[PDB]
Amino acid sequence: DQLTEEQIAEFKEAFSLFDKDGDGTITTKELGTVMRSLGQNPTEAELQDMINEVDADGNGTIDFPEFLTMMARKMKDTDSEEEIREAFRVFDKDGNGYISAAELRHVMTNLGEKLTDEEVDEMIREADIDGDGQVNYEEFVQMMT
Amino acid sequence: FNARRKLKGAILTTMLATRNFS
Ligand SMILES: [Ca+2]
Ligand SMILES: [Ca+2]
Ligand SMILES: [Ca+2]
Ligand SMILES: [Ca+2]
Ligand SMILES: [Zn+2]
Ligand SMILES: [Zn+2]
Ligand SMILES: [Zn+2]
Ligand SMILES: [Zn+2]
Ligand SMILES: [Zn+2]
């Protein structure tokens, strides 16, 4: 409906995952790193277009205001149910339809986040509604809706 | 430690990466 305060915080965490040197901006290099580590393989050419399309001022990098404007649009995405499924498949590395703690540790490590085994088990607990000890599709959708 | 913010931020980052930063 509106951009609530916690959502802004979530968006801030997303931003910081891109903004690897923590200098307030996302470069093509930083964007390239992240996408590579999430198994995407774009080209320098494609990356440059990706920056440009949401660089609505035109200085070659992305700051949080610009990021937020995009994230705001993405909040009313028609292709949203499908975008979430796609992200699920990135996390669910064995395609068995549940995200284990090991799987979550792998992605988080790939994003360059250094977590303790308790910090990981805490994130799983956050989403694990049925108490089985891992996040299934429905729980993932629930959390992100 | 905000486990939910950390997780949802990471999954949002994954959603961005799979749709060419959009
Ligand atoms: Ca940066
Ligand atoms: Ca800019
Ligand atoms: Ca799995
Ligand atoms: Ca579960
Ligand atoms: Zn594009
Ligand atoms: Zn979309
Ligand atoms: Zn489909
Ligand atoms: Zn453990
Ligand atoms: Zn704790």
Numbering used by the authors:
A (entry chain A): 2 to 146
B (entry chain B): 1 to 22
From the paper:
Ca2+/CaM and the E140G mutant were cocrystallized with CaMKIIδ294-315 to gain molecular insight into the interaction. The structural superimposition Ca2+/CaM-WT-CaMKIIδ294-315 with Ca2+/CaM-E140G-CaMKIIδ294-315 showed rather low RMSD of 0.949 Å with difference mainly at the N-terminal region of CaM. Glutamate at position 140 (E140) is one of the Ca2+ coordinating residues in EF-hand 4. The Met144[O]:Arg4[NH2] H-bond in WT complex is replaced by Ala147[O]:Arg4[NE] H-bond in the mutant structure. The Lys75[NZ]:Met15[O] H-bond in the WT complex is absent in the mutant complex. Using ITC, we showed that Ca2+-CaM can interact with CaMKIIδ294-315, with a stoichiometry of 1. The dissociation constant of Ca2+/CaM for CaMKIIδ294-315 (0.052 ± 0.008 μM, n = 8) was significantly increased to 0.097 ± 0.008 μM for the E140G variant (n = 5), indicating a ∼2-fold reduction in binding affinity.
CaM is a major Ca2+ sensor that regulates several target proteins involved in cardiac muscle contraction, including RyR2, Cav1.2, and CaMKIIδ. CaM is a Ca2+ sensing protein able to bind up to four Ca2+ ions through its Ca2+-binding EF-hand motifs: two located in its N-domain (EF-1 and EF-2) and two in its C-domain (EF-3 and EF-4). The associated structural transition to an open conformation upon Ca2+ binding mediates interaction with CaM’s targets and signal transduction. At high [Ca2+], Ca2+/CaM binding to CaMKII releases the regulatory domain from the catalytic domain.
